[PDB]
Amino acid sequence: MRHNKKFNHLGRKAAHRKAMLSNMAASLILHKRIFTTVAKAKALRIYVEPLLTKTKEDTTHSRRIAFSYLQNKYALKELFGDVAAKIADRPGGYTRILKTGYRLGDNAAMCFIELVDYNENML
Amino acid sequence: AHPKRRQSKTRTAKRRTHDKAVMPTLAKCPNCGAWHIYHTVCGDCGYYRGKLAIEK
Amino acid sequence: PGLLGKKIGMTSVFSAEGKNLPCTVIEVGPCVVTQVKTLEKDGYSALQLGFVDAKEKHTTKPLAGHFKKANVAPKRHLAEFKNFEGEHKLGDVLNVEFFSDADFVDVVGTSKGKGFQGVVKRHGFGGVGQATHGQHNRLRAPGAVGACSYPAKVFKGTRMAGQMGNERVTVQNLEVIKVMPEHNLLLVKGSVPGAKGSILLIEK
Amino acid sequence: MKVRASVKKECKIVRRKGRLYVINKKNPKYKQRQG
Amino acid sequence: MDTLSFKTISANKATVTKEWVIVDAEGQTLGRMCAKVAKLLRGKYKPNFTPHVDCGDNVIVINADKIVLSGNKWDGRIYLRHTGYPGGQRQFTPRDFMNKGPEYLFRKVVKGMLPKNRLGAKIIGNLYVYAGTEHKHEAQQPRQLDINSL
RNA sequence: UCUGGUAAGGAUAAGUGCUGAAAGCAUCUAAGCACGAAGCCGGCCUCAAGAUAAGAUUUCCAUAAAGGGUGGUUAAAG
RNA sequence: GUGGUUUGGCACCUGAUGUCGGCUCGUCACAUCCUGGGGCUGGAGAAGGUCCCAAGGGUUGGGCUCGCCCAUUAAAGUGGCACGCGAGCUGGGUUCAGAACGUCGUGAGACAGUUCGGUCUCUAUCUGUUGUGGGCGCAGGAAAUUUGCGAGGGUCU
RNA sequence: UAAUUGCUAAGUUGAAACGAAGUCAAGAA
Ligand SMILES: [K+]
Ligand SMILES: [K+]
Ligand SMILES: [K+]
Ligand SMILES: [K+]
Ligand SMILES: [Mg+2]
Ligand SMILES: [Mg+2]
Ligand SMILES: [Mg+2]
Ligand SMILES: [Mg+2]
Ligand SMILES: [Mg+2]
Ligand SMILES: [Mg+2]
Ligand SMILES: [Mg+2]
Ligand SMILES: [Mg+2]
Ligand SMILES: [Mg+2]
Ligand SMILES: [Mg+2]
Ligand SMILES: [Mg+2]
Ligand SMILES: [Mg+2]
Ligand SMILES: [Zn+2]
């Protein structure tokens, strides 16, 4: 049973899963849109949006707490600069997931996840 | 552990009754005019729900 | 007789004489009479009741016409009850004050679902052997299922693995602690089957 | 009450419900069944 | 090629002579009446009887509750059945069948004097048993029959 | 942690009786009538109309969202 | 006389019908251990003895290996199911190759004997059983609420 | 579901020593 258990293990050990989520968060912050499997993107949406909410308080404390998740200097700089400037005044829902198709090698369901403020044609 | 008898052609086909290939869920593009998977970005034009999503 | 209800949760109260009691809170709520069944037309006497208000977006046209005949707003859950001590017309309301004089009630619900379960959890099987002392791979195994070539079969009713829970269960003789008609609330002593939000049948 | 294959007789022999009885209300230690 | 030129003709679905008859069970014995009813249903009284065709009569039995069982059979005949589970043998009586309904007793007796195949399973549906003398079978014009003549 | 098993509704077993011939006496029995068991059939709980004997009652009836399927967000359901 | 549960008699089935006890899971019978209803007593009551009706449910944990003992319990029943059950378990016992003692034999070796050690294979086809779906039928197409032909469970003290 | 004459009331029907004798029939003292 898994009644009211609310995160995906993603077929990995806990340390591997946390490392992969941190890497995906850094990749999404650096390149504003990335392509990945649907399940991984849905886990990343849970993981990464509380991290973007921490940039609404530009302090040393919030920078350090964000760095505890990220451990990436360039990602931290971009996130507390341009990403924060763009996602100010948006009350959550910073990301969007759109499905695209299937892979040749394993028929994995594919999608891309992006930040809604860096897509112009989607208003 | 071991089949006592070999199966007849009829028995084999009766089991294989329920083997089938799933039909994809295809929607028509009202503007573009082609097939794409429902709830999925139309890869020919890159549009999704009337808005451009993937810029060629 | 009885009404429909929705289980909210559990709490603990202190009685008048200083006894700690575990209580279940049930929102019994107003139930409307949607159909009346007769010996002369249906073959038995019963009252059909509807419980939770539904919008037109979620009501099929046959159900909408069925409610329109009784002149009531559409409901979400219907159930029949029997042996009412009185006469009740089509489209009238019953509330939790119906249970004000009652001392004990019976609660019918659907238990929580466990999915596929083995013999140890489903039936309390002892398990084969010990965890050590030569155990190979039968720790949670059923053991023997028959008695050799004289029956030469497994009997019907043999206890095996399978789906557990998610089925109708009745609990009888739950003491009523308090009735709150201002909130449509009923407090009973003990536990009722099901998860929070599940629909119950409360029989007087 | 004594049950035996051969029952024999102031005791009186009666037949009740397809069974044979030898009864004596004066002395109840002589009742017999299943003649 | 056919060198016979003198054959016996079998009746078929388009050549049978099916009729509705009404018989009474006022004081008859259960088995003795049901044997004649089985003959009527099978079609042994028709000169064009064909064992592979439903060529009999549709029989309506009236006054079914007035049937007679001699001796102590009403409670001394023990019918046995099995539910399929261990320790699952059960007993019942013609009195139990009569309490449930006369049609059940009559159907149980007639199925047992009928052939044990698909045709007999089809034939048993041509029998209609009613407790009283009132039944509703218009548009077919059933013919009264004296079962004591047979 | 709460709840339950419980009585005996009906027919009875072994036994206890009433009236009573055969056999003018007697007799619980052959025509009859009272009882009398954790045992039998029920009451209680769950499943149950493929019960092909396929039952009943209310309401609606073809294309949009009369009914559905495919799809999506998901669940104390799996 | 009955039974076939003891010791036997017979030799009819068997290019393998492959193993004692214990564990697990049962199911059945009654020749009743407890609980229920009774007749008799050399039955005053109190418990006892014997017989009849009755198989629904129950019928412990240890020190030892059929039986004895310790402490309980209302009670710690008797049997059948390939001495139920190893394509479900174990491997203490038992058919194996090493070794030792006693006894027997000139010897190789043997034994109503004893003792230490000593591989338990198989991905479930059919049937069986526990769960869960698809199709069609009933029925011209449906959404709901239901009756109960029957089935199973419950029944201790 | 023939005809005629009897017997069985146990659904007997389609295993013994040993007990009542349930019932019909034939007798003798
Ligand atoms: K969280
Ligand atoms: K068998
Ligand atoms: K054995
Ligand atoms: K039952
Ligand atoms: Mg895994
Ligand atoms: Mg680590
Ligand atoms: Mg397949
Ligand atoms: Mg569940
Ligand atoms: Mg264990
Ligand atoms: Mg091992
Ligand atoms: Mg292991
Ligand atoms: Mg010979
Ligand atoms: Mg062979
Ligand atoms: Mg085996
Ligand atoms: Mg050696
Ligand atoms: Mg060693
Ligand atoms: Zn398009």
UniProtKB/TrEMBL annotation, chain E:
GO terms for cellular component: cytosolic large ribosomal subunit. One of its GO terms (biological process) is negative regulation of translation. Keywords: Ribonucleoprotein, Ribosomal protein. One of its GO terms (molecular function) is structural constituent of ribosome. InterPro entries: Ribosomal_uL13, Ribosomal_uL13_bac-type, Ribosomal_uL13_CS, Ribosomal_uL13_sf. It comes from the Bacteria. This protein is one of the early assembly proteins of the 50S ribosomal subunit, although it is not seen to bind rRNA by itself. It is important during the early stages of 50S assembly. Belongs to the universal ribosomal protein uL13 family. Part of the 50S ribosomal subunit. This is Large ribosomal subunit protein uL13. It comes from Porphyromonas gingivalis (strain ATCC BAA-308 / W83).
